[PDB]
Each structure stands twice: as C-alpha cells, then as structure tokens.
Write a protein that binds this ligand. Structure first.
Ligand SMILES: CN[C@H](CC(=O)O)C(=O)O
Ligand SMILES: CN[C@H](CC(=O)O)C(=O)O
Lengths: 257, 261
C-alpha cells in the first residue's frame, strides 16, 4: 500500500538535503525521522510519500473552537496516515490521536557554559545573578508557568519579573545568548536539542537532569490498523541497535544537514 | 474499569531504591514494611484512582524470564499470568519478549546500558574498551545487559560480546553488587556494564567510581499488568500527568540523592 507521512522541518529530525541538482519526492528530505520511516517501511512493505505539514505547525487545540491544526489535523482529516516528527506525546494530543511506542525520550534541561559549580535547577533558583529563560510561548515556558511545585513557581516568578526579558523568539536565539553571555545567561529547553548544540559548541554543556520526562512517537488517526504493527517494528529496531545508530548518525556525525 | 473502592494485589521485588525494607525499632506490617521509589509511586497512583492495594514480594524472588524449551515464565511475570497479582511495580524492563505475554503501562523511567569504571582514566567510551584487550569488562550473567550484547548487530557491541564470552576467568557476575566490587577492587583492570540508573545510584555513594560515556541502548521500566487488564489505560493517564509535571524526576532525586536506604 501507499501511505502519506506528514512531517515538519526540525533539525536533525527532518531537514532539506543540500544538492546542486534539484531534488523531488522523498529525496528532498533527510534526517533521523526520514531514516526511521524508511526502515519501518522496509519491515512492513508499504510505500509512502513524505509531505511537510502545509501550515507549518505541530498541532495545537483551539480550546474555544475544538479544531486542531498542524500534523494532528492532517491525521484527523484523512490527509496523512502517519505523523513522524519531533512531536511530543501529551495527554492532550492522546485524546484526539493515537501514538506509537516512543522512538526518543527527552525532557526539559539547562544549557549553560562549561566548567562552573552550577549543577542543577536548584542551584539556579537559589541565586539571582545568573539570568535564565526559555522560548517565548513554548512548552518549556509552559512547564514553569503551569507548575504548582514551589521550586518551579519561584523560578517562574523570577523569570517573569526579570528585565530585560529572558524569553526568546527562537531556540537558536537562546543558544546564542548563552554562548555569548560569559555565564550571565542560561537557557532551558529540550535535552535532545541541548545535546545537538553541545555536540557542535565545545564551550557549552547540559546542566542537571531532565526536569520532566516525555517522548516523541509516531502519531496515527484513532484506531489506525498500522499502530501495533509499527510498535513491534520500533521495538525490534531498538533492540537490535538500529535506532542507536541513527541517533549517533544525526547528532554526532552529520555535523549538519 | 472503575477502580474506586477496589483492592488490588501489587507484586514487587527487593531492589535498591525501588523497594527496600524500612528500618524500624518495632516490626512493621503490611505495606508499611516497605519503602522506596516504587512504593511511593503506587501510593500516588492509588490516591489518584481511588483503589486500595497490598504489596507482596514475588515468592520466587525473580523478575520474569522465559524458559524457551518449556515455554514457561517465572517471577512477577508469572504472578500476573496466574492471576495472583493485578499489577507488578518494580525495576522490571519492558522487553519485546515480555510484551508478548503481559501488558505494560506508559514507562515511569527511561534508562540504558552504560559503563561503571574507575574515575580518571583515558577510557571514554565503549569503543575505547572494545578496541583493547588488557582491561576486562563484564556484566550480570543472564540479565538484560547481557541480552543487549547478545542481540546487538552493531559491530562494536558484537565485538565486545565475543570478547566477554571468550574471557577466562569469567567476566560475568552473579549480582550487580559483585560487579561493583570488582570495579572498585580492580583499580582499572575491570569495567562493569549495567543499567545507567544503577550506575547513578552507585556513583552517588562511591566517589572513586564513575560512569563512562553515555547509554549504549535504551529501555524503560513500566508497571506490568495481566494482558488486556481494564486498569492499564487509567494508570497510563496518571503516569503521563506525573511525567508532564516533573513529579517522577523529583521522586528519582529523592531516592537516588536524598535517601540512603
Ligand atoms: C518539538 N516539539 C514541538 C514543540 C514542543 O513540544 O514544545 C511539539 O511537539 O509541539
Ligand atoms: C532490574 N531489571 C531486571 C533484571 C535485569 O534487567 O537484568 C529485569 O528487568 O529482569
């Protein structure tokens, strides 16, 4: 059979491949997610077409309209069979689509300069000289805004009250603000992104662990007949080392893409 | 389906710091005799969903392995299949093999194999170990780490597996604690491959040991249920909410860094 796969550009999950000759179809794209679906399709014997989500969104719920956008909407409107991207499995998305077994685990962590005694979020919340922020309007900021845990409330109050603003318009802007800050600024974001950055900037490091836990998985329309088949392939690819090879390839070897 | 006012049997196994006997001047009874990460976790889940439960240690002291000759399971896996427990909460690895017999919830913890070694050597990775022969390296006999090496098709790990199987005297151990001691007393002559979470627990408590490199694979612990259990999806939602709020990370910090037994 032939499936439509929706995805979104995000380094190094799905990137446009550089080429002197113009590329078409699936060859336009490369990255971890591109390789992952290639391997899944080999096991299960389907063909597929990768299509970027036309609206450029992951999928959020309009809470007063009930409508989804992004890759989620493509699934629910029968324009994609699978969504394969750095798409976070959340209780909310699980109420509208199904998710496979995760292919990657991650969590909020801290990007900072190497070689200081700052070892944890707790070390940042106990001090006031170092400023710290996050992407404006993103899920990292929401983790802090929404928390009822005293530690993270104190941090959110500090972040919201800092001037100039500690929130950035992009993750890259936060990375650069750390890199040029001489320790005056730390940036909270996904641990997988931090690893991507620290593989490419020897002066930076992750600080502490993962303050939350979450995963990326493939999304399907509810009751898709392909979900359990993909779950088994994902576990098999994992247990033989194929996903480990793909992670190293894209985070450590392809210094870009 | 509904869990309010129900009483569940929960099987577990002693394993630090998931489930440990609590110290007390007076003997403790029932659930109060145990403490640890898994004990706190099931308490939280029970409060959210409104059920009661009794913790019972698995009688045969085993996690659950499949005898391929006979088809028989043992351990906590068997207790679920024989309907003598409703849930198994422990450091029980979600594997494809176990998934063909029982169900698992959403994972509560993610981990992977890594290296326990002495602090401050030139060894930086598994690749460094694999390309040399002077430093010996091993794992727990018959466990998930050994199965990972046995099942890897990656050249590095397949090479390591061949080396470990060939080494005389045996590099395998009967417990993780024996492996830890072999690293400590080995002064660099021995490295031990085991779960990253166990390496973290050890290195928090022995300052001369360290983790070398990252994870060589990925695997998770989840709550196991009888197949087709009507409670799995309700528990999944509770776990996802604890994960998204950071409460499992806080629980891990408590049992790994704050408490000592
Ligand atoms: C890279 N993941 C995006 C952004 C986020 O979760 O904050 C998403 O799944 O919506
Ligand atoms: C602590 N996990 C046990 C033992 C092992 O993985 O070797 C298991 O899942 O069987």
């Amino acid at each position: 059979k032939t499936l439509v796969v929706t995805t979104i550009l995000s380094n190094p999950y799905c990137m446009r491949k550089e080429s002197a000759i113009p590329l078409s179809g699936n060859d336009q794209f490369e990255g971890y997610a591109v390789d992952l679906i290639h391997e899944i399709s080999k096991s299960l014997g389907f063909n597929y077409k990768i299509q970027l989500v036309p609206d450029g969104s992951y999928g959020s719920l309009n809470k007063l309209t009930g409508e989804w956008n992004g890759m989620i909407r493509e699934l629910l409107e029968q324009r994609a069979d699978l969504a394969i991207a750095d798409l976070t499995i959340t209780f909310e998305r699980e109420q509208a689509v199904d998710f496979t077994t995760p292919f990657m685990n991650l969590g909020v962590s801290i990007l900072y300069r190497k070689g200081t005694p700052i070892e944890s979020a707790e070390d940042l919340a106990k001090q006031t000289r170092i400023k710290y922020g996050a992407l404006k309007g993103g899920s990292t900021a929401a983790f802090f805004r929404d928390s009822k845990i005293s530690t993270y409330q104190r941090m959110w109050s500090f972040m919201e009250s800092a001037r100039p603003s500690v929130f950035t318009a992009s993750n890259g802007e936060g990375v650069e603000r750390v890199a040029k800050g001489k320790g005056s600024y730390a940036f909270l974001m996904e641990s997988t992104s931090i690893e991507y950055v620290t593989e490419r900037n020897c002066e930076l490091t992750q600080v502490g662990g993962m303050l939350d836990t979450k995963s990326y998985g493939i999304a399907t329309p509810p009751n898709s007949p392909y979900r359990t088949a993909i779950n088994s392939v994902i576990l098999k690819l994992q247990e033989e080392g194929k996903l480990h090879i793909l992670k190293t390839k894209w985070w450590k070897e392809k210094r870009g893409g």
